[PDB]
Design a protein around this ligand. Sequence first.
Ligand SMILES: *[C@@H]1O[C@H](CO)[C@@H](O[C@@H]2O[C@H](CO)[C@@H](O[C@@H]3O[C@H](CO[C@H]4O[C@H](CO[C@H]5O[C@H](CO)[C@@H](O)[C@H](O)[C@@H]5O)[C@@H](O)[C@H](O[C@H]5O[C@H](CO)[C@@H](O)[C@H](O)[C@@H]5O[C@H]5O[C@H](CO)[C@@H](O)[C@H](O)[C@@H]5O)[C@@H]4O)[C@@H](O)[C@H](O[C@H]4O[C@H](CO)[C@@H](O)[C@H](O)[C@@H]4O[C@H]4O[C@H](CO)[C@@H](O)[C@H](O)[C@@H]4O)[C@@H]3O)[C@H](O)[C@H]2NC(C)=O)[C@H](O)[C@H]1NC(C)=O
Ligand SMILES: CC(=O)N1CCN(c2ccc3ncn(Cc4cn(Cc5ccc(C#N)c(F)c5)nn4)c(=O)c3c2)CC1
Ligand SMILES: [Ca+2]
Ligand SMILES: [Ca+2]
Ligand SMILES: [Cl-]
Ligand SMILES: [K+]
Ligand code: NA
Ligand SMILES: [Zn+2]
Length: 806
Amino acid sequence: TSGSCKGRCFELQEVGPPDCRCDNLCKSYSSCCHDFDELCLKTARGWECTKDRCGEVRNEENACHCSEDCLSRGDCCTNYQVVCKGESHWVDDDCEEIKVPECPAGFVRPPLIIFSVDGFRASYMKKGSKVMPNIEKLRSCGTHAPYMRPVYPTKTFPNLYTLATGLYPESHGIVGNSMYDPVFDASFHLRGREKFNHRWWGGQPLWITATKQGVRAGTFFWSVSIPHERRILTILQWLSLPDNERPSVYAFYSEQPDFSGHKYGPFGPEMTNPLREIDKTVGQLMDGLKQLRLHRCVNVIFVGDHGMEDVTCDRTEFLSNYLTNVDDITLVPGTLGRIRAKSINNSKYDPKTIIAALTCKKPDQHFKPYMKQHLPKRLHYANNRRIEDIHLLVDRRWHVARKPLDVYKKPSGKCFFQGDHGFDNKVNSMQTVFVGYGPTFKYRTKVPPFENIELYNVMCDLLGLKPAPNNGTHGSLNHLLRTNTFRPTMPDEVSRPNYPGIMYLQSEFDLGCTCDDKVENKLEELNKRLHTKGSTKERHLLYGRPAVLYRTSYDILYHTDFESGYSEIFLMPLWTSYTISKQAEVSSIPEHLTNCVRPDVRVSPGFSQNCLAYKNDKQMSYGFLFPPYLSSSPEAKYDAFLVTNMVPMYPAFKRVWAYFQRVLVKKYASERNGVNVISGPIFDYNYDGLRDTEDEIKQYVEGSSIPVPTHYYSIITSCLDFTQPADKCDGPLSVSSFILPHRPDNDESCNSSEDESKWVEELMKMHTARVRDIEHLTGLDFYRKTSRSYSEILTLKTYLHTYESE
Ligand SMILES: *[C@@H]1O[C@H](CO)[C@@H](O[C@@H]2O[C@H](CO)[C@@H](O[C@@H]3O[C@H](CO[C@H]4O[C@H](CO[C@H]5O[C@H](CO)[C@@H](O)[C@H](O)[C@@H]5O)[C@@H](O)[C@H](O[C@H]5O[C@H](CO)[C@@H](O)[C@H](O)[C@@H]5O[C@H]5O[C@H](CO)[C@@H](O)[C@H](O)[C@@H]5O)[C@@H]4O)[C@@H](O)[C@H](O[C@H]4O[C@H](CO)[C@@H](O)[C@H](O)[C@@H]4O[C@H]4O[C@H](CO)[C@@H](O)[C@H](O)[C@@H]4O)[C@@H]3O)[C@H](O)[C@H]2NC(C)=O)[C@H](O)[C@H]1NC(C)=O
Ligand SMILES: CC(=O)N1CCN(c2ccc3ncn(Cc4cn(Cc5ccc(C#N)c(F)c5)nn4)c(=O)c3c2)CC1
Ligand SMILES: [Ca+2]
Ligand SMILES: [Ca+2]
Ligand SMILES: [Cl-]
Ligand SMILES: [K+]
Ligand code: NA
Ligand SMILES: [Zn+2]
């Protein structure tokens, strides 16, 4: 319909119908005024000043200007000062530290510009360095990480909306580039108009956070037909607006190098040019800022959404080769797989039969099926109705498809893609980039790799905003910044522990347990009391006891070899802590102690587990949190069989756990010069990544109130300087953790029929976790007493050990 864009080009506030629009998204909606192209998308004379244009009389038809009034008008070509005034390109100036913001009068805060690049793999920073001098200058003069970890799936929309919200895709709702919502009965796709509907997009993205708190924000989306040079000129024009109208945060988005990467693979010879072109665009922005005297005022973030892997048509696994009944399913295909029934509310569709037909069927099978609740917890990819129950994790370099006709399209199936992304977010080729440059970022500083969910908090800090609740750990990235507005502090402990002494006589217990412990001194009797009272506690609890951050009733139990926090509600430890030195020796469970379980005289029969329940439950067995194999003496070993150290374990899981405890702990202590281990149960029956309350538990040991954990964790800490033993470390710490699913079969591990040395450790690596992940799942807070700064501890708690090569 009707109206004009005269005096409205790239207006910031979008107008409602039936009035026509002139903002940077109007093209997407087909709702621009009829003169939008003519007035707002000028192209005459290209994007660069030449010597003969210098001082020209202003011609309003030109794309940009070289006339003398152009600085005052805000619309010079970005190279104006270089061609027409003897100025140097930004890239050609030496790095000079920006100690304080150097902003024109009227700038109330340094603006933030987010420059996002689609498909920019982390290793492009080294491999394309010779063709990206503007980017290489940002990177070396500012703050950079060797790589930034994306979220899963390593697709465009989930990651860019994660960047804007600090939320996992399960929480923000953009769980893929394609998705079907069974409540909406509608599908979201990269291409098309459904994605414009606000109903898909949850959380509070940065532009909304900013606006609600009185900080003006540019649009983060761009119509695809607006060329990059015009996006840049538009941002530079918005930056010349009056103080009261000017945004403080700006976003530029590039579809490259992703668009070429898909055609040519991540390192195709055709990739050099798209990298040169992105660099040139960075150059334009920086020259533009320098003309406006804003180059030592603005904070610039150069950030990618994901990397890019070599993927061709012939590396496609077809479901039709596994299932006889493939027309019964709908598959979301590609570098991940999501399966649901073709016919909604079809009662005779069995996910269990589909999973079974897809499990370990071909020796080199290039995907693994999972019920979504069994996916590695580090992916946080389950708590959303748009995530199908059945998920296929696809090997890097591979695709999955339903039938061959979906891939090999008529006439005779030519391929025409050599690159793709979307795989597991720990995969090297999916890693992407982060550089921060400006007064608020540090000068010439490397920082360790970190996750993109953390940036939202930092952007809010950069803008003086209070972040909406999100999945970052605020303070974990304080080390990126010259000046921090946020001072993290430890959460307050909610429940204080009881410290029970000996309160019960053996004959008060009727637990159906037995142990051969009657076997067989004044000197070694005070020593026993000392231990039960906390004398070895500084050895086994190295970083203070974990804080309990919810209301509950629990006891601290001390022993020679380990300390625990025992829950009277869940009838088992919430945590068990012990230190194993490089010198410690592994021993066996003596014959006469094979089935030994001992009542704990500090803990009431009524708050204890019982052996009878385990006897009666033909599916469920038990294991121990502190391992008897690692007892310091035959006498201390009796403590490991206390009923208060016992936890429910499926026989299939006991294979995993026993190998970890008997073989792997000692190997880690050898490799790391001692380790401290904290282990415990996790209950997450509604798969939301958060500690279950007792009324959420769906499974108990038969005929008891003993709840069955969904997972078991361990956090394994040592000295970063491994020349110092774990128990006498003066400096920073080193951690690796896992959250192992507690499953009644080893179907996940295709080699599980073999010896544990051939599969267990591979499983654990797959289920590697951050300390922070375990904290959410347990309501515990770790590392309460160290000699390290809290910001450093927050970084340590966000660390993920990925087991990739470098
Ligand atoms: C990662 O970080 C995030 C963010 O911190 C964590 O996610 C949060 O987790 C909380 C606990 O699970 C959860 O609290 C819920 O919230 C319920 C209200 O939810 C709606 O409103 C939310 C707030 O909106 C306002 O603020 C934001 C600023 O952030 C603005 O942008 C808004 O516009 C508002 O001004 C809102 O965020 C939330 O969004 C979800 O749902 C949307 C609409 O469908 C989606 O678009 C969106 O993507 C979100 O979807 C996710 O989250 C939902 C669960 O909320 C989930 O189902 C989806 O799969 C997806 O993951 C809503 O619009 C509130 O009703 C709840 O209270 C009930 O339970 C509590 C205790 O659990 C009781 O104390 C309480 O009394 C009440 O019980 C009653 O109601 C029950 C039904 O729920 C009923 O059964 C019972 O019998 C009782 O009657 C509860 O507080 C937050 O909503 C959630 N936020 C987000 C964004 O996801 C996340 O946990 C972190 N992950 C990890 C691993 O740490
Ligand atoms: C939540 C919200 O307010 N809305 C309103 C506007 N809706 C909308 C409207 C017009 C549009 N025109 C073009 N494109 C292409 C495109 C891709 N990208 C990369 C990118 C950039 C930023 C984020 C974020 N966050 C992202 F997810 C993807 N930018 N433009 C869009 O996706 C698009 C989306 C989306 C829903
Ligand atoms: Ca992308
Ligand atoms: Ca839960
Ligand atoms: Cl997807
Ligand atoms: K049993
Ligand atoms: Na198996
Ligand atoms: Zn892509």
